[model samples]
Target: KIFVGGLSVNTTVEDVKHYFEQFGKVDDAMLMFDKTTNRHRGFGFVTFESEDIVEKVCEIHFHEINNKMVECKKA
Candidate 1:
């Protein structure tokens, strides 16, 4: 699993998983959100297999997803 921040509220769990899956198989993906409003909290987590892929992900300093710039890193 890895932590991703700087996400827009429009980002979704599926969006994260599918994006990372391009590098490898994704185990899981989630976006932190407020319980009451169920709104995206601007951060999320993604799990996949591969140290090399993880490195590749981190190299993406400002990956654009859902029309927003995002930051990815190891958890």
Candidate 2:
């Protein structure tokens, strides 16, 4: 799993997938949400079909996605 943080409040699962699609097809994309407010948690999870894709994406300490610099790491 790819742990993604520092996401903008506006970021969505689809948006994350779109950003990762350039490297490879995404298997799953999800954004953590607050149960009480139903708002985003500014973090998410992304899963790719291959490990290479995860490694490739994590190479960048802070990735620019949706105009926000997000931190990515292998989970």
Candidate 3:
């Protein structure tokens, strides 16, 4: 599992997938949204093809979105 955050409320799973695709194919991507507000909750999860990619994303891109520092740790 991977933790991803600092996303725009307007961003979607597709957007996250697109970003990771810049590096390689993503096995799974998701954006956690609030049903009451019907908007992204600024954080989500993305499962990579391998832990190698997970580490790369965690280091390079995980916490660097929307000018906010995010985090990725075991769930």
Candidate 4:
């Protein structure tokens, strides 16, 4: 999949998965929240089913999600 950053505090892993799943199936979605502050770390990882879809996700809508400023690569 890809990496997303600048997520809002209320964001959840499902939220992230649903958001990107619009592009394709998500293998995994993680929104790293800190226990000390109980807030989203402003970043997470999304695993897609294929590298092509990952690249498409980056090229197409990386800027659509509030200018979410995401990063996509084969991982």
Candidate 5:
């Protein structure tokens, strides 16, 4: 699993999934949201099909999405 931070508010679950998919098969992707305002929390989790993929993902330290640089860490 991976914890993604610094995500843009407009980023969606599909956007997260698609970005991480470049590293490996994405088993799941989710973005936390503010229930009251229905807005993204600027962070999310991504699960890969294989545990090894997590290391590959974190190797770069950061990734770009929606013109923003997002941090990636093992979870």
Candidate 6:
């Protein structure tokens, strides 16, 4: 699992899944949302099929999603 931060409010689960898919197969991807406001929380988690892929992703530290530079790290 990977923790993704600094995401744009407009960033969706599909957007994250697609971006991370470049590194490896995505088992799942999700974004948190504020229940009251029903808005994106600007952070999320990505689960890859293998731990090797997780390391491969984290090695880069930063990733671009929806034109915004986001941070990626192990969860």
* Clash count (model 2, backbone only): 0
Off by over 4 Å in 3: 38-40, 60-75
Task: Show the colliding residue pairs in model 4.
Answer: 1-48
Write the residue-wise lDDT of candidate 1 on 1-75 in tens digits: 877777676567888888877755778877775556655447788877865787778677687767667888866
Candidates 2 and 4: which is better by lDDT? 2
In candidate 5, what are the lDDT values of residues 1-75, reduced to their tens digit? 777877766677788788777666877887664556554447788888665867766667557876667777666
TM-scores of all predicted structures: 0.78, 0.75, 0.61, 0.62, 0.74, 0.75
Whichever of 1 and 4 has more lDDT, that candidate is: 1
Q: What is the C-alpha lDDT of each candidate?
A: 0.74, 0.71, 0.61, 0.62, 0.72, 0.72
**Which pairs of residues have clashing backbones in candidate 1?**
none
Candidate 2 has a TM-score of 0.75
User: Candidate 3 — which pairs collide?
Assistant: none
By TM-score, is 4 or 6 better?
6
Q: Any runs in candidate 1 off by more than 4 Å, and if so which?
A: 34-41
2 or 4, which is superior by TM-score? 2
Which 10 residues in a row give candidate 3 its minimum summed lDDT?
66-75
The number of clashing residue pairs in each candidate reads 0, 0, 0, 1, 0, 0
Worst 10 residues of 4 by lDDT: 61-70
User: What C-alpha lDDT does candidate 4 achieve relative to the native structure?
Assistant: 0.62
lDDT of 5 at 35: 56
lDDT score, candidate 5, position 75: 68
Which prediction has more favorable lDDT, 5 or 6? Answer: 6
